[PDB]
Every structure is written in structure tokens, then in C-alpha cells.
Amino acid sequence: FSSLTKYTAVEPGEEASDKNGALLGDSVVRTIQTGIRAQFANSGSNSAFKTMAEIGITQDGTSGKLKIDDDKLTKVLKDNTAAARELLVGDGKETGITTKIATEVKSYLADDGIIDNAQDNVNATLKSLTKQYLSVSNSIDETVARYKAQFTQLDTMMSKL
């Protein structure tokens, strides 16, 4: 997701830049990132330890990389695996991170899914742009036809002289 951020800032001194970022002009991926990160914050645990606090799963200070504490995670899991069982698995039927992630992904893959709707809108937009390209192409063809008529006229005038 951090690799999807393409940006080249330009000061007023230099002219306009032709290069455009791959993921720019599009906020749906940012919404997906926010939703995924928020759902990653577990709060439906049956145990009092709703958060993964006791285990030792720590996100990075500036980014979402899990700066996992190997010795802390190891000492906690040798202390008790039951906390891990009751933390994220929960009941195992409906409660749990995996269940909601899978359900929302199954929603996304369908037509009602936000990613599917985004790509449908993308293809509709590019088809409208293809219609615009056809319009510009026929205008270019007409203008080139006039230019070639003028060029042949100039050739005829130079031949007369």
C-alpha cells in the first residue's frame, strides 16, 4: 500500500510535469486501507484483552509494519496460549478477525463490492474517453484532409509557375 503512493512534488519555479502517479485521482484504495486498518483493531474479543496488547504485536511508529517483539511474543506464548486462543479466534463461529475479513472480501468480489464498482466506473470512464478519442480522431482526419487539399493546391500553383 505504501508502494502505491507515487508523488513528485514540483515547485513554482519549474514548469508542469507530464508524469502522473499510478494511484492518483483515486481515493477508493485509501478507503480500503483505512477500513482494513480499522478492522485490524480487534474489539470483539470474548476475553477482557480485546486488544493484542499482552501478546506483543506492535505496529511501526510511522507506518503499518508490525514491529513484532520476538522475545516478548515468545515469552507471552510460553506464558499462555489460551490468551491467544481467546483473543482473535473468539467463539470461532462468527466472532474473529478472519470471519469479518472473509465476509467483507466476499462482498467486495461481488458486483455490490466497492472494488468491483470502482473498476466498473473505471471502464465506463475509459469508454467515454474512447468516444472522446474517436471524436478527436475524426476532427483530426478532417483537418488533415483540408491541409492535404491545401498542399495539393500549393503544388498545382507551383507547377503552373
Binding site: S27, T31, T34, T143
Partner: protein, 100 residues
């Protein structure tokens, strides 16, 4: 730029932070140095003792996250509208100059 000898209150979770009080408001001397007073003449600091009820603080933090993402979406669609308008202007003007 002038240091004043004055009674300093306790500050921090442990209370060992020696928070200097200036103008009747206690400003944490730890972060007082290196901060521009012009932008924020009266910044908020950790008050005496502690502030309870963390639940409303977490609710405020998540509301801040929500309003920040809303502002980000507003900015996104705003410059998207600006970009499409300027692109339409550019292509219209180049078609016109090609025609002329």
C-alpha cells in the same frame, strides 16, 4: 528569551516533570524550548494530577480520524475536479488553435 525564576508545578504521569508556569498558565518546559511562540501563544499541556474518563478521549480520537479522512476525501475530489477542468480547458484550447 529571558528565563524567570518562579514556582514550577508538577507535570507528567509521574509528576517529576518540572512544569514552568508563565503568565498564569503552566507550559511544559520540556517542550517549551524549540517551539515557535508566534504560532501558538497558549498551547495546551498536561494539567495537574490526571484526566480520567479515557473512553471519551478515545471517542474523540476516532472522530478526529474520521474527520481527517473526510477532509482527505474532500481534498481528493476537489483537486480531481480542478484537474479535469484544467484538462478540458487545455484540450479545448489546443483543438481551437489547431482549428485556427
Amino acid at each position: 528569551g529571558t528565563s524567570k525564576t518562579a514556582l514550577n508545578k508538577l507535570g507528567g504521569a509521574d509528576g517529576k516533570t518540572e512544569v514552568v508556569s508563565i503568565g498564569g498558565k503552566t507550559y511544559a518546559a520540556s517542550k517549551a524550548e524549540g517551539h515557535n511562540f508566534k504560532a501558538q501563544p497558549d498551547l495546551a499541556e498536561a494539567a495537574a494530577t490526571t484526566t480520567e474518563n479515557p473512553l471519551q478521549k478515545i471517542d474523540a480520537a476516532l472522530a478526529q480520524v474520521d474527520t481527517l479522512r473526510s477532509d482527505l476525501g474532500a481534498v481528493q475530489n476537489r483537486f480531481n475536479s480542478a484537474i479535469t477542468n484544467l484538462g478540458n480547458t487545455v484540450n479545448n484550447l489546443t483543438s481551437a488553435r489547431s482549428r485556427i
